Amino acid sequence: GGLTCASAPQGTLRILEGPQQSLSGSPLQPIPASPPPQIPPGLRPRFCAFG
Amino acid sequence: DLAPGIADSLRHFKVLREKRIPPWMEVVLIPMTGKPSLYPGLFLFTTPCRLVRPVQNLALGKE
């Protein structure tokens, strides 16, 4: 029950949970481009010149 | 050599709502450059009354 002292420890192993692999996909997923505005189909002159 | 790999696995918990990481946490890794930049650290904010805005994290695909 004396509990004598011991020598100096050489190395200290650190145990830790691993990096989060297979979380990010190898291609990227962007928000798609909002489309450029279209001229709508079915546009015709509705105004006739009077008389 | 671990602090970039901890700031990624705390955004990969916030955008996926895991391990009681709140969605409004700021994972801020101010890096060590060796120049008079900001004071380096890994500062995690969870308190209210801040400002926050949504983006799309491109690696996962979520807001």
Curated annotation (Swiss-Prot), chain A:
Source taxonomy: Eukaryota, Metazoa, Chordata, Craniata, Vertebrata
Chain coiled-coil ranges: none
Name assigned to this protein: DNA-directed RNA polymerase I subunit RPA34
Biased composition (Pro residues): 29-41
Subunit composition and interactions: Component of the RNA polymerase I (Pol I) complex consisting of 13 subunits: a ten-subunit catalytic core composed of POLR1A/RPA1, POLR1B/RPA2, POLR1C/RPAC1, POLR1D/RPAC2, POLR1H/RPA12, POLR2E/RPABC1, POLR2F/RPABC2, POLR2H/RPABC3, POLR2K/RPABC4 and POLR2L/RPABC5; a mobile stalk subunit POLR1F/RPA43 protruding from the core and additional subunits homologous to general transcription factors POLR1E/RPA49 and POLR1G/RPA34. Forms a heterodimer with POLR1E/RPA49. Part of Pol I pre-initiation complex (PIC), in which Pol I core assembles with RRN3 and promoter-bound UTBF and SL1/TIF-IB complex.
Record gene name: POLR1G
Location of this chain's protein in the cell: Nucleus, Nucleolus; Chromosome
Record's miscellaneous remark: It is in an antisense orientation to and overlaps the gene of the DNA repair enzyme ERCC1. This gene overlap is conserved in mouse, suggesting an important biological function.
Function: Component of RNA polymerase I (Pol I), a DNA-dependent RNA polymerase which synthesizes ribosomal RNA precursors using the four ribonucleoside triphosphates as substrates. Involved in UBTF-activated transcription, presumably at a step following PIC formation.
Residues where Phosphoserine is found: 26, 34
Residue segments, region Disordered: 18-41
Signal peptide positions (record): none
Top-level taxonomic group: Eukaryota
Family classification: Belongs to the eukaryotic RPA34 RNA polymerase subunit family.
UniProtKB/Swiss-Prot annotation, chain B:
Localization (cell): Nucleus, Nucleolus; Chromosome
Family note: Belongs to the RNA polymerase beta chain family.
Purpose of the protein: Catalytic core component of RNA polymerase I (Pol I), a DNA-dependent RNA polymerase which synthesizes ribosomal RNA precursors using the four ribonucleoside triphosphates as substrates. Transcribes 47S pre-rRNAs from multicopy rRNA gene clusters, giving rise to 5.8S, 18S and 28S ribosomal RNAs. Pol I-mediated transcription cycle proceeds through transcription initiation, transcription elongation and transcription termination stages.
Quaternary state and interactors: Component of the RNA polymerase I (Pol I) complex consisting of 13 subunits: a ten-subunit catalytic core composed of POLR1A/RPA1, POLR1B/RPA2, POLR1C/RPAC1, POLR1D/RPAC2, POLR1H/RPA12, POLR2E/RPABC1, POLR2F/RPABC2, POLR2H/RPABC3, POLR2K/RPABC4 and POLR2L/RPABC5; a mobile stalk subunit POLR1F/RPA43 protruding from the core and additional subunits homologous to general transcription factors POLR1E/RPA49 and POLR1G/RPA34. Part of Pol I pre-initiation complex (PIC), in which Pol I core assembles with RRN3 and promoter-bound UTBF and SL1/TIF-IB complex.
Recorded domain comment: The active site comprises the fork loops, the loops and the rudder that stabilize the transcription bubble and assist polymerase translocation.
Illness: Treacher Collins syndrome 4: A form of Treacher Collins syndrome, a disorder of craniofacial development. Treacher Collins syndrome is characterized by a combination of bilateral downward slanting of the palpebral fissures, colobomas of the lower eyelids with a paucity of eyelashes medial to the defect, hypoplasia of the facial bones, cleft palate, malformation of the external ears, atresia of the external auditory canals, and bilateral conductive hearing loss. TCS4 inheritance pattern is autosomal dominant.
Protein name: DNA-directed RNA polymerase I subunit RPA2
Organism: Homo sapiens
